[PDB]
Amino acid sequence: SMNPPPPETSNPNKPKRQTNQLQYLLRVVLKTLWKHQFAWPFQQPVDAVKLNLPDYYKIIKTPMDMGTIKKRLENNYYWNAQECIQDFNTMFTNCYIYNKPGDDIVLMAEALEKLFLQKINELPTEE
Ligand SMILES: Cc1noc(C)c1-c1ccc2c(c1)[C@H](c1ccccc1)N(C)C2=O
């Protein structure tokens, strides 16, 4: 009626596997971002109805969030680390497209992206 359905988090037609990189993505990358002071707005899809943002899902056509990412990791939805890293990048990029520089939500996203890029830089070799 207003919010779209969320991005897919299970589908037996999607190829998937477990890898050491995807396991790092969950144990290190996601859990470090999740517990941060500024994580809360990113922990579930944007609720455009609650927020009175009738333009959000006209502007953001590939929504993403960390709740979605957590479910995709916990359900082993991904084929590789690059797909998961793409989701994080989409989440951050969406935030910056929709909001103004120096908006609180952007400063919050920036703080989390800084941490994300630190953890990604130590993505271990596929083993
Ligand atoms: C993430 C995200 N990308 O664009 C928007 C808009 C959001 C977004 C997602 C959720 C919320 C808020 C904003 C918003 C808010 C405004 C300012 C600072 C912090 C939180 N609030 C009250 C929420 O529960």
Curated annotation (Swiss-Prot):
Phosphorylation by CK2 disrupt the intramolecular binding between the bromo domain 2 and the NPS region and promotes binding between the NPS and the BID regions, leading to activate the protein and promote binding to acetylated histones. In absence of phosphorylation, BRD4 does not localize to p53/TP53 target gene promoters, phosphorylation promoting recruitment to p53/TP53 target promoters. Residues 17-123 form the Bromo domain. Transmembrane segments: none annotated. There is a cross-link at residue 58 (Glycyl lysine isopeptide (Lys-Gly) (interchain with G-Cter in SUMO2)). The record marks 99 as: Acetylated histone binding. It is found in: Nucleus; Chromosome. It comes from the Eukaryota. Ubiquitously expressed. Belongs to the BET family. JQ1, a thieno-triazolo-1,4-diazepine derivative, and I-BET, a benzodiazepine derivative, have been tested on tumors with success. Treatment with GSK1210151A (I-BET151, a I-BET derivative) has strong effets on mixed lineage leukemia and promotes myeloid differentiation and leukemia stem-cell depletion. The NET domain mediates interaction with a number of chromatin proteins involved in transcription regulation (NSD3, JMJD6, CHD4, GLTSCR1 and ATAD5). Chromatin reader protein that recognizes and binds acetylated histones and plays a key role in transmission of epigenetic memory across cell divisions and transcription regulation. Remains associated with acetylated chromatin throughout the entire cell cycle and provides epigenetic memory for postmitotic G1 gene transcription by preserving acetylated chromatin status and maintaining high-order chromatin structure. During interphase, plays a key role in regulating the transcription of signal-inducible genes by associating with the P-TEFb complex and recruiting it to promoters. It is linked to Cornelia de Lange syndrome 6: A form of Cornelia de Lange syndrome, a clinically heterogeneous developmental disorder associated with malformations affecting multiple systems. It is characterized by facial dysmorphisms, abnormal hands and feet, growth delay, cognitive retardation, hirsutism, gastroesophageal dysfunction and cardiac, ophthalmologic and genitourinary anomalies. CDLS6 inheritance is autosomal dominant. A chromosomal aberration involving BRD4 is found in a rare, aggressive, and lethal carcinoma arising in midline organs of young people. Translocation t(15;19)(q14;p13) with NUTM1 which produces a BRD4-NUTM1 fusion protein. Interacts with p53/TP53; the interaction is direct. Interacts (via CTD region) with CDK9 and CCNT1, acting as an associated component of P-TEFb complex. Interacts with RELA (when acetylated at 'Lys-310'). Interacts (via NET domain) with NSD3, CHD4, BICRA and ATAD5. The interaction with BICRA bridges BRD4 to the GBAF complex. Interacts (via NET domain) with JMJD6 (via JmjC and N-terminal domains); the interaction is stronger in presence of ssRNA and recruits JMJD6 on distal enhancers. Interacts with NSD3. Interacts with NIPBL. (Microbial infection) Interacts with bovine papillomavirus type 1 regulatory protein E2. This interactions may serve for the tethering of viral genomes to host mitotic chromosomes allowing successful partitioning of the viral genome during cell division. This is Bromodomain-containing protein 4. It comes from Homo sapiens. The chain holds residues 44 to 168 of 1362 of the full protein.
